[PDB]
Amino acid sequence: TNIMLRKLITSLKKQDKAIWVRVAEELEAPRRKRAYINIYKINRYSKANDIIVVPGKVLGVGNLDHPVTVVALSFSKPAKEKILRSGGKVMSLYKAIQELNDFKGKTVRLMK
Amino acid sequence: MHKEKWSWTVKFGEGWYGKHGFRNPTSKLVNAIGLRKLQEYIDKVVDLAKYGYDKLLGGGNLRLPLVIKVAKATEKAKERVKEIGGEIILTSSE
């Protein structure tokens, strides 16, 4: 129903990396079953300066040790400032397509 | 029921019929907080009696050495606070 979520799904499918096609397929789940992740789980299953791709919303339960770059549909405002305060970065799925390192990124993890 | 819906009762209706036990008129009301949840008030000594908390539970664990004043605590909470370097004072009321 969202105009911008529909235009994002149509451009992810045009991408030629299986990572982005899987994100578009996952964003078409029923809203009641859409994916999300908390900060504590990103911390447990990652290393410093990783790249985490979440096909949903990032929520702020738990704490973060190491700096990471997280790519997600949306961020909770308490969760966004937890990530930046530990030295990390945040991008939207729209900007991650165009980024030059994200053109040919390495050490990328897909999480939920 | 017991006549024609008793096929439902014997399978999905345990406790539908009968009495079991009693209620205590004078049960003590206890407000419990765990170690995992204690890391927020609500965003060095911590006095938990001020916020209406009675017992401290084992939960997960803390991250800093703290002094906690509660009426009661669990055995796991007492030992895990010592490991970080904290200490628990059992004061029933401040």
Binding site: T1, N2, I3, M4 | -
Partner: protein, 251 residues
Amino acid sequence: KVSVLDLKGNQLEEIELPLFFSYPVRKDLIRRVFLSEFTKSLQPKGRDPLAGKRTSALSFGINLGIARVPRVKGSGEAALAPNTVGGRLAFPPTTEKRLVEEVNLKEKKLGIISALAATADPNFVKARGHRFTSNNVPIILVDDFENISKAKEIMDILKSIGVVDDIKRVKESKGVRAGKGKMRGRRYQIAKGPLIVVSNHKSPVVESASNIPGVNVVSANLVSVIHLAPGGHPGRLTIYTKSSINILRQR
């Protein structure tokens, strides 16, 4: 980035709008908030609770034949039933029906932001119907516009800044509507015109411009979706003052 105009339409400044006005326009969200505020102004209707039942009609039974059916009839003639003439309604309207649609306060405030951005997009303003020859949208006027007191010299301002073509569009009143609405006081149907947002109520311009056909005046801290997107369609032509932007920046 927009320019500020004086009462003669000349450019004299250059300011940057808050980041609210760059939000995407979400027609699904604006329709949620408009339909909620619309249903808050509806009154409860209902029928007479006893209409059709003010009788003691009863069934005659069987074996009469001439009492053609087991229907209720009062000494011969039909009464009380939903299929008979002069009987009761089967499901009459009642005052118990729920009319209002709620929205969350946080969801409402996002819908107002989305509508405020649609008035800064020239594509949505031209696609809603409005006619204007100004090259800048929205129009930002100096605060001396607050003190205009005569409806004749409001029209002189709208001509200079290039908005009076929307007044002519409105002034071609869409005459008498169709239906039973005209029987009930709803005789005409008029187009919507430019909207004026001012710093505070009680300013002179609130009353002076209240007669101009199609226009509405509202304070910067009261405005909502019913003003920005009437009918559910975003992009109403809007005029702001310099100090109404600062009041908006704090929401």
